[PDB]
Amino acid sequence: RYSMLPPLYDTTKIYLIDNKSSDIQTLNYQNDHSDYLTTIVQNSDFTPLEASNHSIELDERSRWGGNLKTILYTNLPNITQHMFSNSFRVKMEWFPLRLPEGNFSETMVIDLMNNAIVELYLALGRQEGVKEEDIGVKIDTRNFSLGYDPQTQLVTPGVYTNEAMHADIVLLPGCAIDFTHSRLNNLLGIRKRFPYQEGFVISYEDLKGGNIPALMDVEEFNKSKTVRALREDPKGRSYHVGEDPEARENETAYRSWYLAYNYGDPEKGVRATTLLTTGDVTCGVEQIYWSLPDMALDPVTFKASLKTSNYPVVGTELLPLVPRSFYNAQAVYSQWIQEKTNQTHVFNRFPENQILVRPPAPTITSISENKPSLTDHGIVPLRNRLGGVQRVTLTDARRRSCPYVYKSLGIVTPQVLSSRT
Amino acid sequence: YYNSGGNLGVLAGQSSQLNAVVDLQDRNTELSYQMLLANTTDRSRYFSMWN
Amino acid sequence: LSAANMLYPIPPNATQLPIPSRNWAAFRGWSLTRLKQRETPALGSPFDPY
Amino acid sequence: MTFEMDPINEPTLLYVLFEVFDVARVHQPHRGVIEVVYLRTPFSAG
């Protein structure tokens, strides 16, 4: 039964269009595109604000259910402060880092991380008297083991193989990175084997057994048939070949989480603490708790709280952040072309250092994308006095009222369930 | 707040869990209280416990 | 004041014409008075920036 | 309705209010159940 109209029977359709919320702007001054107010009553005879007064009264002799259909398409950027996708922490101490917001690919985010680390080094990190090659943090998507001849205890080529493999964490004694409140591990690829405990605080002295093997002098080999490690970068940067005691002198001081996950003790090394994960640039796919205080009866063991985000949840669906993977065989060549066209060396400030070089772009690029999603949430119990003004709220998995939601549309089809009340 | 959609008097029983207060954009309950006082009692005398 | 207050804006001249259809049962009467747009706030929102 | 008014410079608004029957009866069945039914008779509500 709707007032001033003949009653309808059995089923019907109720549209919670967000475009109608723009006709009652007086009620939505402080409401974003995810926590707005709309009106069910759609008749041209009244202005929308006045039609919001009327209410649709389903019969009180039956417990009215409802099939809820949803159209959702949020334009969420990949790296945000809202999703904790840009926070970072580097020890040498305990300097936090921040990345610029925006939609970026995996290699772009890795480059931004390296650039932020270098910028923080340039900001008060070098004025105190730290020599520039003493930076102890690097993210190089490389495997520092290809062509490593055990008999000579060195990698035979004079250049580390510039392949993709998997992103890792390169740590020098002392400085280390320990991020717990950020989700950058999801995109670069690393996860705790035993989460929920304290956080993700992998550091030096943890990656024992994976020290980067040194590399031999190609020029000196071709000159005198002698084999020895690169103790000095041609530009004047030590490779810390002789440092890191308890490890043989043919390995540098860098730790290289990858080549420490592998080729190491599994029950005692970083293997027992962290595991490899495919790089999900979306920082881990989340879900949106569809919440609607008015028509839907409170589901089991939920109460309406004060928080504008902690409303009872009527339904849930996956966040429309689907990481689609692209394959480019000449990814390194494309990266070189991009570096040339950038006309600046900000993303590659040490092109000559074999360890501090800009990490190669992975051959599997998995940039995120935003797509509309239509889902059916099944039968939802309703009330018998569905009002005109209704609140429609979409919240994060932590009930944080995500504000990037765009064009959230819900369709409800009432049905008769049971009887009485 | 009295007639804002976002803010409501959700006064209700423990078992019903259904709002017993509805306000819809039109009931000027503030002017209602003003007229109620001005009619029931004389308002030339100031009561200090309210305004 | 059992009533239903409706406010209709007035450009600074002339006349105006309100209201579509309805029912009109138990109607009691009208009460009309002009206010200023600057003075009248918007009560439908938690905050009124204007 | 048509209103003819003395014109003033600053923009203004009309505040015609329709005197209606706005009543509500509260029913309290048992030990923590409170149900209120509203009724605005000319202008449909509740």
From Swiss-Prot, chain D:
Cellular localization per UniProt: Virion; Host nucleus
Domain of life: Viruses
Modified residues (Phosphotyrosine): 38
Stated induction or repression of this protein's expression: Expressed in the late phase of the viral replicative cycle.
Reported function: Major capsid protein that self-associates to form 240 hexon trimers, each in the shape of a hexagon, building most of the pseudo T=25 capsid. Assembled into trimeric units with the help of the chaperone shutoff protein. Transported by pre-protein VI to the nucleus where it associates with other structural proteins to form an empty capsid. Might be involved, through its interaction with host dyneins, in the intracellular microtubule-dependent transport of incoming viral capsid to the nucleus.
Note: All late proteins expressed from the major late promoter are produced by alternative splicing and alternative polyadenylation of the same gene giving rise to non-overlapping ORFs. A leader sequence is present in the N-terminus of all these mRNAs and is recognized by the viral shutoff protein to provide expression although conventional translation via ribosome scanning from the cap has been shut off in the host cell.
Family under the similarity heading: Belongs to the adenoviridae hexon protein family.
Subunit structure: Homotrimer. Interacts with the capsid vertex protein; this interaction binds the peripentonal hexons to the neighboring penton base. Interacts with the hexon-linking protein; this interaction tethers the hexons surrounding the penton to those situated in the central plate of the facet. Interacts with the hexon-interlacing protein; this interaction lashes the hexons together. Interacts with host dyneins DYNC1LI1 and DYNC1I2; this interaction might be involved in intracellular microtubule-dependent transport of incoming viral capsid.
Name the UniProt record assigns to this protein: Hexon protein
Organism placement in taxonomy: Viruses, Varidnaviria, Bamfordvirae, Preplasmiviricota, Tectiliviricetes
Residues of the full protein shown: 862 to 907 of 911
